[PDB]
Design a protein around this ligand. Structure first.
Ligand SMILES: CC(C)=CCC/C(C)=C/CSP(=O)(O)OP(=O)(O)O
Ligand SMILES: Oc1ccc2c(O)cccc2c1
Ligand SMILES: [Mg+2]
Length: 301
């Protein structure tokens, strides 16, 4: 539909506007069109995300894609929207659907860079463990090499994975997190072992509230690149930063972000990311939501 595509792109520029970021129709429209059948309000999930620090000059957009529409990476390559990297990452989405039950897909893009990643979601009542994932042939060797570490902190069930084709990186979105895993003592030992930035009292309180935790891995080394804790809420003042600059900008985005589901309050998902040298914050404001998110808010918010 022309209306859906134009409606989503309209909301996108608006969201980008709040952040003072410029959009590139050339790299956005061809993508939205290819997946126009998914933009139908109802069982669609659309997110517009911002990030602090050195990552504050970009706007990412995530869009769900039902499995019925077919492998989305196969789609973007075939239509000439993205080139095969000639790297194992080219086979991972496909190999994942081959070895595990994939219940849904999603793609991610940037308003100025275009397509950059896909997601493979697994059934909430049949998620794979680290063991099952590391078995996929094109999966980074780093996952198996980190199996013991993950196990030591209770990181077991994975609700979904993502593949970043430009950075050749994979995210493991761990779910059903035990209270222990998210307690300060556990979080600190984990970061310490992964050699990441140590969070303070504010950061740790935020981690304790997390519904999802995700490490980023690569094919070059067994060293985890970064670790992110995600929080879902309607509260627009949850950014885990003490910098008046962030506290301001994020609250702004959080209360002025465009969303279609008028009648309810914006669904927000905050993120605290820890890399070896720093810590930065992220915020996704859902434009489209489904009951999945409605349920998460009752369980964690
Ligand atoms: C349900 C849907 C639409 C998918 C979730 C989108 C999602 C998990 C994206 C956030 S990822 P992100 O915080 O930007 O992390 P990186 O790719 O930078 O590692
Ligand atoms: O910005 C988002 C939106 C949804 C997410 C999810 O369902 C799981 C883990 C992290 C997420 C981050
Ligand atoms: Mg992103």
């Amino acid at each position: 539909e022309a209306a859906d595509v134009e409606r989503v792109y309209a909301a996108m520029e608006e969201a980008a506007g709040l952040l003072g970021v410029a959009c590139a129709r050339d790299k956005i429209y061809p993508l939205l069109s290819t997946f126009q059948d998914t933009l139908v309000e109802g069982g669609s999930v659309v997110v517009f995300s911002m990030a602090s620090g050195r990552h504050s000059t970009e706007l990412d957009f995530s869009i769900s894609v039902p499995t019925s529409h077919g492998d989305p990476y196969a789609t973007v390559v075939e239509k000439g929207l993205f080139p095969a990297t000639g790297h194992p990452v080219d086979d991972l989405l496909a190999d994942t659907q081959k070895h595990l039950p994939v219940s849904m897909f999603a793609i991610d893009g940037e308003v100025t860079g275009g397509f950059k990643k896909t997601y493979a979601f697994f059934p909430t009542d049949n998620m794979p463990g680290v063991a099952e994932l590391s078995a996929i042939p094109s999966m980074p060797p780093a996952v198996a090499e980190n199996a013991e570490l993950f196990a030591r902190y209770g990181l077991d069930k994975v609700q979904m994975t993502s593949m970043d084709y430009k950075k050749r990186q994979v995210n493991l979105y761990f779910s059903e997190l035990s209270a222990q895993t998210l307690e300060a003592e556990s979080v600190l030992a984990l970061v310490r072992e992964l050699g990441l930035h140590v969070p303070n009292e504010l950061g740790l309180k935020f981690c304790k509230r997390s519904f999802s935790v995700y490490p980023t891995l690569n094919w070059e080394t067994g060293k985890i690149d970064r670790l992110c804790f995600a929080v879902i809420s309607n509260d627009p003042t949850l950014v885990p930063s003490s910098d008046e600059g962030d506290i301001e900008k994020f609250h702004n985005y959080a209360t002025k972000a465009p969303y279609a589901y008028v009648g309810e309050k914006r669904t927000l998902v905050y993120g605290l990311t820890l890399s070896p040298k720093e810590e930065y914050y992220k915020l996704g404001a859902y434009y489209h939501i489904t009951d999945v998110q409605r349920g998460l808010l009752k369980a964690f918010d």
